[PDB]
Amino acid sequence: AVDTAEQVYISSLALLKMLKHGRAGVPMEVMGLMLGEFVDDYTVRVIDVFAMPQSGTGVSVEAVDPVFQAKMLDMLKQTGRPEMVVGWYHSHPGFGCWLSGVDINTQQSFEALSERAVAVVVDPIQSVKGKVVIDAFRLINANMMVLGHEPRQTTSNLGHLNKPSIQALIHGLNRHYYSITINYRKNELEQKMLLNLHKKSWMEGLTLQDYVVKEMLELAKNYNKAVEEEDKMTPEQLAIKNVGKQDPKRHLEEHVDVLMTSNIVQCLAAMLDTVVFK
């Protein structure tokens, strides 16, 4: 029918299960499923993503056992709330992305079975805390080729989705595909608590247990002599003449902030007796 920009709200559990399931899916490109809710055409929130067992033949739709689904989701029937399987995912866990043939194996199968049927491409490599490395698309019919493929009613998100200058094989396969927007929805109760448990765990010291104070200053006066003489030897050879030559080699000597922050640490940790004591 008519087309309007589809939005993938993700559950953050889905983000965790993708990273974990592809992390365990070490090179061997695992398959799993997507289990969600039909809200409309132009959005989808996924609420649950669980695991599918490893098959060593070939990443296929024929490895999807439907009675495995029946039994697993049967256990999940009274457990919380079940919904429709709305898709699937495969993995390319070392390199970024491309539009696989596994897509054109199972995508026609799950667009026969389900309606939205979103393909999902994943990688864990490109960062550890600050990127969106997963990728997702959807197969286009051949029958819409009479229509020119340029309507879109809200072109901010296609002005944000075309905007990253799509990389290699996606627009190697612009045909048989059309892209889809994946934001991270409002997950603030988890966001604040992982912020807490990141600068409370993933940065050392559980704050009762920081207040190294002295042997670090033995090593730091080693620093504040060894760094110092090299801070001395160099700017003797600055432009002490009247030359108009303009070609620098750049080394940016300065060494200030090490001294500064380390010795603020040294003074306020020498404070620890008069601070924690009385």
In whole angstroms, the minimum distance from the beta carbon of 142 to other proteins comes to 18
Helix axes 215-233, 257-270, angle to 10 degrees: 150
Q: What one-character DSSP code corresponds to residue 96?
A: -
Helix (H, G, I), strand (E, B) or coil at 147: coil
Site string for other proteins, 100-139 (x = CB under 8 A): ----------------------------------------
Q: What is the number of other CB atoms lying within 10 angstroms of the CB of residue 123?
A: 19
- Per-residue three-class SS string for 195-232: HHCHHHHHCCCCCCCCCCCCHHHHHHHHHHHHHHHHHH
- Measure the CA–CA gap between 36 and 44, rounded to whole angstroms: 8
41 marked ligand binding residue: no
Q: Which of 7, 10, 29, 85 binds Zn ion (CB under 5 A)?
A: 29
Query: Residue 92 binds which one of other proteins, Zn ion, none, with CB within 5 to 8 A depending on kind?
Result: Zn ion
Least Å distance, CB 39 to other proteins, is 18
Q: Give pairs for 152-158: CB < 8 Å, separation 24+.
A: 152/3, 152/4, 152/5, 153/4, 153/5, 154/4, 154/5, 155/5, 157/5, 157/7, 157/181, 158/5
Closest approach, Cβ 89 to Zn ion, in A, equals 9
* CA dist 208 → 38, 120, 193, 202, 211 (Å): 48, 43, 19, 15, 6
Q: CB of 80: closest distance to other proteins in angstroms?
A: 34
CA–CA distance, 185 with 141 (Å, rounded to integer): 29
Pairing outcome for strands 135-138 and 119-121: antiparallel
Hey, how many other C-beta atoms are within 10 angstroms of the C-beta on 22? 21
Could you tell which of other proteins, Zn ion, none binds residue 148, using a CB distance below 5 to 8 A set by kind? other proteins
According to DSSP, residue 236 is labeled G
Give 114 or 157: the residue with its C-beta nearer to other proteins. 157
Q: For residue 103, say whether it is annotated as part of any ligand binding site.
A: yes
Q: Is 185 within 8 Å of 209 (Cβ atoms)? A: no
90 is in an annotated binding site: yes
The one segment of 27-35, 158-166, 233-241, 249-257 that binds Zn ion by CB under 5 A:
27-35
Query: What is the footprint of other proteins within residues 140-199 (CB under 8 A)?
Result: 147-148, 150-157, 159
Nearer to other proteins, 146 or 276 (CB): 146
Task: Count residues near Zn ion (CB under 5 A).
Answer: 4
The yes or no reply on residue 92 touching Zn ion (CB under 5 A) is: yes
Examine residue 243 and tell whether it contacts other proteins (CB under 8 A): no
Stretch of 87-95, 138-146, 214-222, 267-275 lying at the interface with Zn ion (CB under 5 A):
87-95
Q: Which residues in this chain contact other proteins in the complex, by CB under 8 A?
A: 2, 147-148, 150-157, 159
Q: Which residues in this chain contact Zn ion in the complex, by CB under 5 A?
A: 29, 90-92
Q: Give binding residues as ranges.
A: 90, 92, 103
Q: Give binding residues for Zn(2+) as ranges.
A: 90, 92, 103
